[PDB]
Amino acid sequence: MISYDNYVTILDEETLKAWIAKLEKAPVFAFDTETDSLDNISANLVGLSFAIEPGVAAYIPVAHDYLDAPDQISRERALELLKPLLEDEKALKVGQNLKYDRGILANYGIELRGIAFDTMLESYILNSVAGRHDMDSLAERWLKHKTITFEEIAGKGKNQLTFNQIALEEAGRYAAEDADVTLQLHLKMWPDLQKHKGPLNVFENIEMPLVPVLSRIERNGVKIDPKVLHNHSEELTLRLAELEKKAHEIAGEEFNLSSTKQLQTILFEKQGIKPLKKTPSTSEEVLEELALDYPLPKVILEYRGLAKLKSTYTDKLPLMINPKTGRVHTSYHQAVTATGRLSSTDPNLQNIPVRNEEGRRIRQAFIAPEDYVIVSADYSQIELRIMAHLSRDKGLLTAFAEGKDIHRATAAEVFGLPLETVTSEQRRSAKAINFGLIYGMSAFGLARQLNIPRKEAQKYMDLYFERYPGVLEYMERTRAQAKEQGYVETLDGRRLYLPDIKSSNGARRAAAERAAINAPMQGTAADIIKRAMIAVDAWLQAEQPRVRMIMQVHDELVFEVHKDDVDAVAKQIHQLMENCTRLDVPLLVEVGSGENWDQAH
C-alpha cells in the first residue's frame, strides 16, 4: 500500500515556507493541483501537492470542508506564499497534464510559468501508440507501480465524493503520490527522450509550448446561440416526420428506416439487387448508388443523416453551455491521435459535416459577441502541398507555385488536355486520386470511390505515376524505411511506430503500410498547425490586440476579432501562419470573416 507515513500533510505556514525554500533550489520539481470538479472554469482548488525528490512529496489541503475538518492554511494565504514560485519562469515544473493545472491557477489570477515537462507528452512523443498516456497506465508501464485511483478515495456512481469531502490524510496519500510518481516518470523518460534529436525537437518546441495555449483556447470557450439550435431542432422534427411519410407513400404500410430488417423487404422486393448497405460504409454504399435514379433509398439516406445530426449537435450543444461563462468549452486532447493531430470532444468539432447543408446550419450557431466578428484562417490543402514537397515533384510544385487548382492541373496532365478545358468529371477523377495517395488507397479502393471498374482505376494511377514519378518514389522509399527501422517521421522529427510492418499477417500488414505513407503528411500538417498556434498565441500575449483564438478544427484556426480591427488583424494572422512556421513547404492561408462560423468558413 501507501500509508500516511509516506508523505507529509502541511497544515501550517512555517512548514509550507520550509518547503517553498527547498522547492526554490531544486533543479526541477513535480507539482499537482486537486479540485472539486473536472470542469476547469468552475472548479475550486481544494489542495496542492509537490515532490522535490523521489519519495519526498507533500500535500497542502486548503479547502476541505467536511464536518469537523481540521484547520488548514487558507486557500488565499497558501496561494500568495506560493505565487512567486509558480509565476517564476526559471523555476522548472514537471506535471501530468499541466494544461489542467495551469487553468486552475488562472482562476486565481496566477500565471503558471516554467511549464517545462509534462509526463503525458513525454510518453506521447516517445511512442504515440505504446498505449494510454494517463498516469495510472504510465506508472504501471515504466515503474511497475499501481497508483491509487480516484475511485479508491472518492467512490463510484452518483454518490461519489468531491475532493473537498475526502479526509485530509486520504486525500494526501492520493495527491502526494501523483506528484511523486510524476517526478519518477520524468526521471525515467526524460533521459530516453534525448537518444534522438527528432522527438526531442517536437517535444521541446511544439508540444510543450502548446500546453498553455490549449488551456487558453479551452478557457476562452465559444459563443453558441441556443435559440438558433432550438429552431433547427423543431424544424428537423418536422422534416423527419415529412421524410417518414414520403417513405411510406413511395411503398405501402409503415416500417422503420432500419436496413437488413424493413428495407430489404421493400427495396429489392420491388426490384433491385439483394445485398444491403452498412451504416465497409465509405466504400460500398448500396443506398446511394440507387439514389441516382431510385427515390426510396434516397429519402432513407437523408432521413438517417438528419436523425444522427439532431441528437448529436442540435439537442446536445445547448446543454453544454457553461452557466458561469455562458459559453461552450470544448476539450482538446493533445496525446491521443497516432499521427500527432489534435482531437476534440464535448463537442467533437471535427464530426460536424463540412460539405453538407445541415452542417452549415450547425456552424451558423457559433456566433461572435456584440461588436466582434468570427474570423477563419485555413491552410488550403496543406497535406497535398506537403506531399508535393516530400515527393520533390516539379510538376506538383509548379502547379501550386503558379496558383493553379491542383485537381484540374493533375487532370490536365493525367488525361492530357488543356487546363481551361478540363471537365468536372475529370477534375473529380484526379481529386479522388490525389487524396487517395495520401491515405495510401489501393487501385481498387479508388474504383469504389469513383464508381469506375477495376483496372480502369489502375489505368488512371499508372498514368498518374508516369506523369508524377516523384510520388511513386516517395511512396516506395517510405515503405522502405518503415520496414528498415519500424517507424516513419514527419518533417519536424515526430515518429509513428509501425509494429505490424513485417506482421506476417496480410491485412494487418497492409494497414501498417498505408499508415507508413499517410503519417508523414498528416503528422507534418499537425506539426505545422501547432507551430502556427504557438506563433499566433505569442503575438496575442505580447501585443494584447482585441482578438481571442477560440477553436482549432482540421486545418483551420477560428478567432473572435473586433469589428473595427478586422483588416489589420487579418493581415497579421495571415503572415504569422504562412511565414512563421515551416519555410520549406509551399503554404497558403485563406482568411475569411462573418457574423458566425459558417459565414467566415
**Which one of Zn ion, Mg ion, none interacts with residue 555, CB within 5 to 8 A by kind?**
Zn ion
Nearer Cβ to Zn ion, position 378 or 513?
378
Q: After which residues is the chain broken (C to N over 2.5 A)?
A: 279
Nearest approach in angstroms of CB 582 to Mg ion is 20
Nearest approach in angstroms of CB 189 to Zn ion is 16
The C-alpha atoms of residue 438 and residue 457 are separated, in whole angstroms, by 16
Nearest approach in angstroms of CB 242 to Zn ion is 35
**Which one of Zn ion, Mg ion, none interacts with residue 178, CB within 5 to 8 A by kind?**
Zn ion
Beta pairing, strands 487-489 & 495-497: antiparallel
Nearer Cβ to Zn ion, position 219 or 239?
219
Contacting residues toward Mg ion, per CB under 5 A: 410, 434
The C-alpha atoms of residue 50 and residue 144 are separated, in whole angstroms, by 22
Contacts of 513 (CB under 8 A, 6+ apart): 440, 479, 482, 501
Nearest approach in angstroms of CB 216 to Zn ion is 18
Q: Which amino acid is at 472?
A: L
Nearer Cβ to Zn ion, position 171 or 267?
171
Nearer Cβ to Mg ion, position 241 or 417?
417
Nearer Cβ to Mg ion, position 166 or 406?
406
Nearest approach in angstroms of CB 436 to Mg ion is 10
**Which one of Mg ion, Zn ion, none interacts with residue 330, CB within 5 to 8 A by kind?**
none
Buried b (16+ CB within 10 A) or exposed e, 432-464: bbbbbbbebbbbebbbbbbeeeeeebeebbeeb
**Which one of Zn ion, Mg ion, none interacts with residue 537, CB within 5 to 8 A by kind?**
none
Nearest approach in angstroms of CB 329 to Zn ion is 18
- Per DSSP, the residues of 368-404 read PPTTEEEEEEEETTHHHHHHHHHTT-HHHHHHHHTT-
> 470 is written with which cell numbers?
516523384
Nearer Cβ to Mg ion, position 267 or 414?
414
Nearest approach in angstroms of CB 483 to Mg ion is 25
Contacts of 485 (CB under 8 A, 6+ apart): none
Nearest approach in angstroms of CB 473 to Mg ion is 13
**Which one of Mg ion, Zn ion, none interacts with residue 358, CB within 5 to 8 A by kind?**
none
Contacting residues toward Zn ion, per CB under 5 A: 32, 96, 178, 554-555
Contact 123, 189 (CB under 8 A): yes
**Which one of Zn ion, Mg ion, none interacts with residue 560, CB within 5 to 8 A by kind?**
none
Contact 230, 365 (CB under 8 A): no
Q: Is 488 left (phi over 0), alpha (psi -120 to 50) or beta?
A: beta
**Which one of Zn ion, Mg ion, none interacts with residue 434, CB within 5 to 8 A by kind?**
Mg ion
The C-alpha atoms of residue 511 and residue 505 are separated, in whole angstroms, by 10
Nearest approach in angstroms of CB 511 to Mg ion is 23
* Beta bridge partner(s), residue 556: 378, 553
Contact 311, 240 (CB under 8 A): no
Residue nearest to Zn ion (CB): 178
Nearer Cβ to Zn ion, position 265 or 575?
575
Nearest approach in angstroms of CB 451 to Mg ion is 20
The C-alpha atoms of residue 487 and residue 485 are separated, in whole angstroms, by 6
Nearer Cβ to Mg ion, position 303 or 468?
468
Helix (H) or strand (E) holding 74: none
Nearer Cβ to Zn ion, position 401 or 417?
401
Contacts of 132 (CB under 8 A, 6+ apart): none
Contact 527, 383 (CB under 8 A): no
Backbone angles phi, psi at 502, to 5 degrees: -125, 30
Nearer Cβ to Mg ion, position 123 or 434?
434
Nearest approach in angstroms of CB 574 to Zn ion is 6
Cis ω before 347 (30° cut-off from 0): yes
Nearer Cβ to Mg ion, position 425 or 595?
425
Contact 566, 572 (CB under 8 A): no
**Which one of Zn ion, Mg ion, none interacts with residue 410, CB within 5 to 8 A by kind?**
Mg ion
**Which one of Mg ion, Zn ion, none interacts with residue 32, CB within 5 to 8 A by kind?**
Zn ion
Count of other CB atoms within 10 angstroms of residue 218: 18
**Which one of Mg ion, Zn ion, none interacts with residue 596, CB within 5 to 8 A by kind?**
none
**Which one of Zn ion, Mg ion, none interacts with residue 391, CB within 5 to 8 A by kind?**
none
